[PDB]
Structures are given as structure tokens and as C-alpha cells.
From Swiss-Prot, chain B:
Homodimer. It catalyses: (E)-isoeugenol + S-adenosyl-L-methionine = (E)-isomethyleugenol + S-adenosyl-L-homocysteine + H(+). Changing residue 126 to Y: No effect on substrate preference. GO terms for biological process: methylation. GO terms for molecular function: (iso)eugenol O-methyltransferase activity; protein dimerization activity. The active site is at 254 (proton acceptor). It comes from Clarkia breweri. Belongs to the class I-like SAM-binding methyltransferase superfamily. Cation-independent O-methyltransferase family. COMT subfamily. Disulfide bonds: none annotated. This is (Iso)eugenol O-methyltransferase. It is an enzyme of class 2 (transferase). Expressed in petals, style and stamens, but not in stigma, sepals, leaves or stem tissues. The gene is IEMT1. Keywords: Methyltransferase, S-adenosyl-L-methionine, Transferase.
Length: 352, 349
């Protein structure tokens, strides 16, 4: 009677992978860009007209698209309306929902679509089959699936390396654009370094904003190899646990959550060493809320903890106090919560 | 209501996109928890239990087991799969766990979830783009054969598929039997695509002077337990169907195109006496893609069929009557309803 409601929830959980994978298909097919591009504002189009812009002849593609688009419409990833024919046949039409703004290329050409592709990638789904073992036997699920850690593995699978760095790059641009309009911590620096900065998108944004500043974008060689040339950006291949380039300030975004506290200590000590006396580590990370609340912002940080649990070299999301404890543990004397964009807080560990 | 767009309206859209990116975390986490027996352990103990206390009940050699459990449970908790209280987090079962733990007759929906989240059934999603662009079925593109054919060659997935269906049907049919009266009267009932025979065995338990025929493909009948009053028969339903006073098809139509369903239903019509009936137990497509849980369940399952089956889809009440009529049946009724599973009757009135 509501036993009914528990049963259905159970059914929904079971098949819940359908939504991401289906959406993954729609993005791969470019079926959102196609909508953004053809459609009147607040207007929507039909699966038949969408199919017409696909490289296909498959009398079935309209029907298949309609079925996909329906599922996304029930979860508000796309809008919809029903148009009843005199016979009573109902035609469905779909439009752009607010989330589409971030799943279709913006002015600048950026979205979160590549990130979705990363997080739905075939490579990242294997690890889940090993989580049960990892809880029993110790180890890390990714390491059990493949013969190595994630980043090593990135240095062997060139497809996933490009998908990962693009995924990271897209996400970070959207966010750094926002951090850069509120946070002022990069003021009065001559050298900035980005430790684990990927293909250097974040560094290029820092320099575009403060031309005087010399960026060093630092990451693993297989990542650096795939880095565009940026005016003001020196790329450097290296390993952060062996040391880190010298600069007035250091930036780590999405680095600490990848590793154990013991690894962050090592990194952080390396950062302390690499800094002048009044220098600092700018830390860009999610912050774990104090409870399992149902909000989107919270499910996101919690989702990523789980990601980290499956792909981890001992990664985890952390509270503010935990970050404070990492700062203290590594010789930092001051701590600042300076801003936040899309669940990414910007913390400063100061050595004052 | 028109919402202007601001930082708040944008931040929410950014966060929703992130949540979609990784939404697969939920059923995979849930899976791992069911695999470790984590829910069942909870079911039988203290009403809140710490991750440490659960771990002490697991054959583990991993000192980080409790912490790892906490991280998975926090994610479940977040979605109301499990409940929590604070000291540390202690965890309790949420109402949904009523159907995810072997509860009463040793039955739950846990084995269905294990079917749905199984490697074999996830692969076909990487082929969906292909099928659409190039034609075909995502599953066949992954495995070189249709899904029922594949079960016949993978013994592991065959057991996992039959178990999933058997334990799902067992819950639903129990409710159908309390509700629906159309089995009463019949002297012979045949279940076409009945699987392991759970449903047939249920029918005879309730109506011991009924003869039941459980009909399915040879490879599935071979794993079917002996039941009082149930005759198991292996065959292909498209070649024909054993004779009965009434035919039951639970979760069959939705596996196939209109064409395939028309052959089936025609076989059923020919297997029946002049007043015979086909009893059809299927979801029915609601009118809109509304956000309720019930509707998501049928829409989820419509998309599943897209990935795995030959022309299978969900259908409106009208499309069902259309199949009924196109197949000789003159009468049509929507009899009852359990857990969004409608029982329709195609009558040769
Ligand atoms: N030992 C190591 N030394 C340097 N970089 C490392 C590393 N281990 C991982 N990384 C890098 O850390 C990153 C984690 S994802 C972080 C990307 C984020 N937008 C950023 O630019 O900071 C990846 O780019 C990975 O290549
Ligand atoms: N051509 C065919 N002939 C007979 N059975 C078939 C078939 N194709 C598929 N099946 C069976 O149809 C079932 C679909 S799953 C449905 C099982 C459900 N609980 C029930 O009792 O109906 C599977 O058991 C599959 O083996
Ligand atoms: C800890 O394991 C990791 C996982 C990822 C995956 C990111 C995709 O959402 C990236 C880096 C890691 O270190
Ligand atoms: C594996 O193929 C099937 C799966 C389901 C449900 C799957 C997961 O929720 C239902 C019918 C099928 O034929």
C-alpha cells in the first residue's frame, strides 16, 4: 500500500544505471548539441528531426531516440510536451532543461559533457566488480581489475588518458572561471605553480587573468605530453612525491582527495619545502558535510568519495577540520576558507 | 513559474550535471553491499549498528574494512536506502530494505538487483550509440547473439537471470494471487515463458486441483526444480504453445516487437478452447514521463528493453488491446494490479 512504494523504489534502484548510460549514449550521439542548435528558445523538437541530423539511415533511430529522450525527460535532464493526435496517438517533443546549459558547449565552447564521458567510461566501471573483494581482502578495486594504479594505467591506455584530461580540463575551466571572479589570492604573486595541474587549463586561466604572473603547470609526463602551449605557462613533467617546482604560491585542485593522508603529508611537506617563508598552498577541494543529507551538493561530494574508494590510492573526501589537520601536520601555521564554486572550496594553507 | 538565472540557479544546474555523471555509483555501491551480505547482517542485529560491528561479522582480513563500509553506507544513507543516527555513524535499514533482504519465504529483490547490475548486462550500454546509428540491438552487438541465446551458453548468467526473475515474480505473484481471481475455475493453466517455474508452482500451491504447465526454452527448463502439480516443457513459443484452459504470460510481450507478439498471441489463441483466455501481466506506459517512482520503473524498464531485447518496449493500454484484437481476441479487460504490474485478460469472448 506503501509496501508498494518500497518495492518500486527497490526496482528503481536495481536498474538505476540506465540514466547515466542512456545519457552517455545521447551525448556521444551529439543529441544535445543538436537540440541547442535547432530549436526555438523555450521551444522543443521532435526525435524525428533530431535523427535527421545524425549520420545514419536506420528507420528505427527516431523511435530509439524518443525512448532515450523519454527516460531523460522523466528525470528532468530534458524538458518535454505531449501532443495528442486526433486518433489519440501521442507524439512526444523535447527541449533543453536548465542542466543542459552545462551539458552543451557554452560561449567559449565548454561543457561538463566530457566529464560525464569520463565518469561513465567503460574503464571506470570495471573497478566496481572488485569492491567486494577489496573490502574482504584489502587492496584497491581499480588495482585489482587492472594491473596497476589509475595513473600508471593512464600512462598505458592513451584513450583513457585523453578522456580523463579532457574530462578534468572541461570541469576545471567551468569552475576556475567562477573562482577567478570571487577569489583574490593570486594577487601580488610573481610565480604560481599548479601541482597536478593536468593539461594546464587552470594555469592558462590564472595567466590570462594576471599577465605578470609566471605559471608552472606540473604533472606526470604522459599528461604533460598532451598539453597545449600556453602563453605564460611552462609545462613540467615530474612526480609530486619526489618534489615540486619552486614558486611564491602553489595550487592543488583535486589532488588531496585522490590520496591517503600519508600521501598528502608527503605532498604537503614537498609543498612547504618548495615555498618561500611567507608563501602558501592554495587547496581546491570539495568539503564533506557532517551528515548523509539528501541534497544534490552533498550527493555530489559523497558520490566522489565513493569514486575515490573504488579508484583510490587512498583517496577520500575530507571535513574542514581534517584539512586543517593536514595543514598543521605539514608545518603550516595558518588556514583560510577563501571561497567556493560548485561545491569546490578554495582553502589557503599559509606558512606565516 | 519563471526562474531568472542567477548563481544559485546555475550552481544547482552544475551540481545536477555532476550527480548525473556519477549516478552509477549508487547501484554499484548497493550491489557491493548486497554481495557482502551487508543488508542481511544488519537485518539480524541490535536498532542501529556501526560499520565496525558489521565488519566483525564479515570474513575479512582488511583492517580498513569498517571505514570502507562507512563510506559505502553513507552513500546509501544519502539516498534513503539505509538510515543513520550520530554519536561516528550508526546505520539502520530503511523501508526499502524490506524488499532487499531475504525476508519471509527466503525471498527478496536482492537477486534481481544482482542481475541488473551484472557485468554481462552492463556491457550492452557501450554499444547503444552503435545500434542507433548502424541499426540492430546493443546486446547482440556486444555478444554476437540475442540475450536468450546467450543465457544458453553462459551458465553463470543463466542462473543469475533465472534467480532474478524467480525472486521478482515470487514477490509480485503473491500479491496478484491475493488480488486477482481469474485463476479460479481453470482446470489447466499454462505459463508461457514461465522460467524456473516459480509462478506455476505458486498457482498450484493456491489451487491444488489445477494442472500447471511451465513452458520455456530447453536450457532454462533444465534448471527448473520439481514441483507438485507442475509439468515442465521445453520448446520455442514461436513454433507453438501447449494447450490449456488459459495461458499466462508474465513479462513476455515486453521482450518483443509487435510482429513477434502477434505470432505468440496467435499461437495462444490456437492453443485455447472457444472461451479461453490469455492472462497478460505487464507494466503499462503512463501518459507522461512524470517524475514519480512508479513511472520511472516502467520507463527504466522500457530503456532496458532497448538495450537487450529484439524489438521489446513498453506499451499503453491501447497498444495491448490492439495486439489482442489483431490476434483474434474479441474481449479485453484490465483485471487487477500489483506493484505496477497489471493483469490484463485477452478474451475469446
Ligand atoms: N605523483 C604525481 N605527480 C604529479 N602529478 C600527479 C601525480 N599523481 C597524479 N597526478 C596528477 O594529478 C591529477 C589528478 S586530477 C586533477 C586535475 C585537476 N583539474 C588539476 O589540474 O589539478 C591528474 O592530472 C594526475 O596526472
Ligand atoms: N522463444 C521462446 N520460447 C519460450 N520461452 C522463451 C522464448 N524466448 C524467451 N523465453 C523465456 O521468456 C522469459 C522472459 S523473462 C520472464 C520470466 C517471468 N517471471 C515469467 O514467468 O514469465 C525467459 O524465461 C525466457 O527464457
Ligand atoms: C583515487 O582514484 C582516482 C579516481 C579518479 C577518477 C576521476 C573520474 O571521476 C581520478 C583520480 C584518482 O586518484
Ligand atoms: C537480462 O534481460 C532482461 C532483464 C530484465 C531486467 C534487468 C535488470 O533490471 C528484464 C527482462 C530481461 O529479458
Amino acid at each position: 500500500s506503501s509496501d508498494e512504494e518500497a518495492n518500486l523504489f527497490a526496482m528503481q534502484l536495481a536498474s538505476a544505471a540506465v540514466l547515466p548510460m542512456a545519457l552517455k549514449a545521447a551525448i556521444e550521439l551529439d543529441v544535445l548539441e543538436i537540440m541547442a542548435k535547432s530549436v526555438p528558445p523555450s521551444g522543443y523538437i521532435s526525435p524525428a528531426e533530431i535523427a535527421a541530423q545524425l549520420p545514419t539511415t536506420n528507420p528505427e533511430a527516431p523511435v530509439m531516440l524518443d525512448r532515450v529522450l523519454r527516460l531523460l525527460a522523466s528525470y528532468s535532464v530534458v524538458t518535454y510536451t505531449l501532443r495528442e493526435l486526433p486518433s489519440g496517438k501521442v507524439e512526444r517533443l523535447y527541449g533543453l532543461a536548465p542542466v543542459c546549459k552545462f551539458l552543451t558547449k557554452n560561449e567559449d565552447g565548454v561543457s561538463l559533457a566530457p566529464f560525464l564521458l569520463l565518469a561513465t567510461d567503460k574503464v571506470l566501471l570495471e573497478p566496481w566488480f572488485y569492491l567486494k573483494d577489496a573490502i574482504l581482502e584489502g587492496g584497491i578495486p581499480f588495482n585489482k581489475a587492472y594491473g596497476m594504479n589509475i595513473f600508471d594505467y593512464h600512462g598505458t591506455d592513451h584513450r583513457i588518458n585523453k578522456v580523463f584530461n579532457k574530462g578534468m580540463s572541461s570541469n576545471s575551466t567551468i569552475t576556475m572561471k567562477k573562482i577567478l571572479e570571487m577569489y583574490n589570492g593570486f594577487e601580488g604573486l610573481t610565480t604560481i605553480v599548479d601541482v597536478g595541474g593536468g593539461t594546464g587549463a587552470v594555469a592558462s586561466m590564472i595567466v590570462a587573468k594576471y599577465p605578470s604572473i609566471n605559471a608552472i603547470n606540473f604533472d606526470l609526463p604522459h599528461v604533460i605530453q598532451d598539453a597545449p602551449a600556453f602563453s605564460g605557462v611552462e609545462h613540467l613533467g615530474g612526480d609530486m612525491f619526489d618534489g615540486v617546482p619552486k614558486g611564491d604560491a602553489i595550487f592543488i585542485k583535486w589532488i588531496c582527495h585522490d590520496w591517503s593522508d600519508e600521501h598528502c603529508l608527503k605532498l604537503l611537506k614537498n609543498c612547504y619545502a618548495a615555498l618561500p617563508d611567507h608563501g602558501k598552498v592554495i587547496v581546491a577541494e570539495y568539503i564533506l558535510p557532517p551528515s548523509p543529507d539528501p541534497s544534490i551538493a552533498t550527493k555530489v561530494v559523497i558520490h566522489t568519495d565513493a569514486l575515490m574508494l573504488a579508484y583510490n590510492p587512498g583517496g577520500k573526501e575530507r571535513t574542514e577540520k581534517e584539512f586543517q589537520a593536514l595543514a598543521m601536520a605539514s608545518g603550516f601555521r595558518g588556514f583560510k576558507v577563501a571561497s567556493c564554486a560548485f561545491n569546490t572550496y578554495v582553502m589557503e594553507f599559509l606558512k606565516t
